[PDB]
Write a structure and sequence with these properties.
This is Beta-lactamase. Monomer. GO terms for molecular function: beta-lactamase activity. The chain is an alpha+beta fold. It has a single domain, classed as 3-Layer(aba) Sandwich (Beta-lactamase), CATH 3.40.710.10. Helices cover 35% and strands 22% of the residues. The strands form four sheets. It has a ten-stranded antiparallel sheet, sandwiched between helices. Strand 2 and strand 3 form a beta hairpin. The longest helix is centred in the first third of the chain and has 18 residues.
């Protein structure tokens, strides 16, 4: 642990924890490709369990990065194409508003106004069909971006259909296992419960509740070690031996749409490096991140740019996570916390750390 990294991380994260009253936090910095780990505070306040490198945190929407890469892997396998109509994989989806809505639109939140959340009322699979059949777009496909669990969540479910695997089985066998993410889970097994941190929301210990398309949109739990390895794999996909997964990673960092200075990937979001920190910091606030914005199609998509800030924020009711990396500098960070605290604080801290190391 070079003193520079120690000092930079501690000087930034200590005040963040104090200001945001975060109960527990783990941070990994990837510097010249190698990970360095830092932990603070409590996984479980009541039982006095500390955060360790083995603590599992809810990733919330950082999960979308795994879904985007798994979709990418399915494209690379020749199982799906992003240009395919959604109805090719869900023939029961016969309502006319779906004409012209492709898997690309689903993956990138550009289908025309699919809502942020699947309604809590949608419990059964027939409920889910009804919901999509009845949904009315506000906009033509590929014209506006509206960040949405119901959009990429459906992409993930459809993407694994030709494999015949459940979403969880496909994720395990095709992404987690080959990458040796052996402490990353969609459903935490009983053996790992001792490591599963509680999230804290208004002082109450909470875990994410089951919901439709949860696995696909926000349901991954992982350790800081596995998340560092996830960043390493995304920094350098060519080191990955499994050909379709290497390609999948590359596809997820391709640039499909532009809004303002951000580019939409599959799960990942990207900006040119060097970035303007106000732009990524203010841009991460849900006031902008969850807003409806016109998009410019990137025709054809630009392949993964190495000089990019690639990142994703994610939260559940009790957790707040952030991952960011810059391929061309072999530099990244993962910040996992068991409080959902404001995005701009996460991105500010990440930028202060990476900027100092870059």
């Amino acid at each position: 642990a070079p003193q520079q990294i120690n000092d930079i991380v501690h000087r930034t994260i200590t005040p963040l924890i104090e200001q945001q009253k975060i109960p527990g936090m783990a941070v990994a910095v990837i510097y010249q490709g190698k990970p360095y780990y830092f932990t603070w505070g409590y996984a479980d306040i009541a039982k006095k369990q500390p955060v360790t490198q083995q603590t599992l945190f809810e990733l919330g929407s950082v999960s979308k990065t795994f879904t985007g890469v798994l979709g990418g892997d399915a494209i690379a396998r020749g199982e799906i194409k992003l240009s395919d109509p959604t109805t090719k994989y869900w023939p029961e989806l016969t309502a006319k508003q779906w004409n012209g809505i492709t898997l690309l639109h689903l993956a990138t939140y550009t289908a025309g106004g699919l809502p942020l959340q699947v309604p809590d009322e949608v419990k059964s699979s027939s409920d889910l069909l009804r919901f999509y059949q009845n949904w009315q777009p506000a906009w033509a496909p590929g014209t506006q971006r509206l960040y949405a669990n119901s959009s990429i969540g459906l992409f993930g479910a459809l993407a694994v259909k030709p494999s015949g695997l459940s979403f969880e089985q496909a994720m395990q066998t095709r992404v987690f296992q080959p990458l040796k993410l052996n402490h990353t889970w969609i459903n935490v097994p009983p053996a790992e419960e001792k490591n599963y941190a509680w999230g804290y929301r208004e002082g109450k210990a909470v875990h994410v509740s089951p919901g439709a398309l949860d696995a696909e949109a926000y349901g991954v739990k992982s350790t800081i070690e596995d998340m560092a390895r996830w960043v390493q794999s995304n920094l350098k996909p060519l080191d990955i031996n499994e050909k379709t997964l290497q390609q999948g990673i590359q596809l997820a960092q391709s640039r499909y749409w532009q809004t303002g200075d951000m580019y939409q990937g599959l799960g990942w979001e990207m900006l040119d490096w060097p970035v303007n920190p106000d732009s990524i910091i203010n841009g991460s606030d849900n006031k902008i991140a969850l807003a409806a914005r016109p998009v410019k199609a990137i025709t054809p998509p630009t392949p993964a740019v190495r000089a990019s800030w690639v990142h994703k924020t994610g939260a559940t009711g009790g957790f707040g996570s952030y991952v960011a990396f810059i391929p061309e500098k072999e530099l990244g960070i993962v910040m996992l916390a068991n409080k959902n605290y404001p995005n701009p604080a996460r991105v500010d801290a990440a930028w202060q750390i990476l900027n100092a190391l870059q």
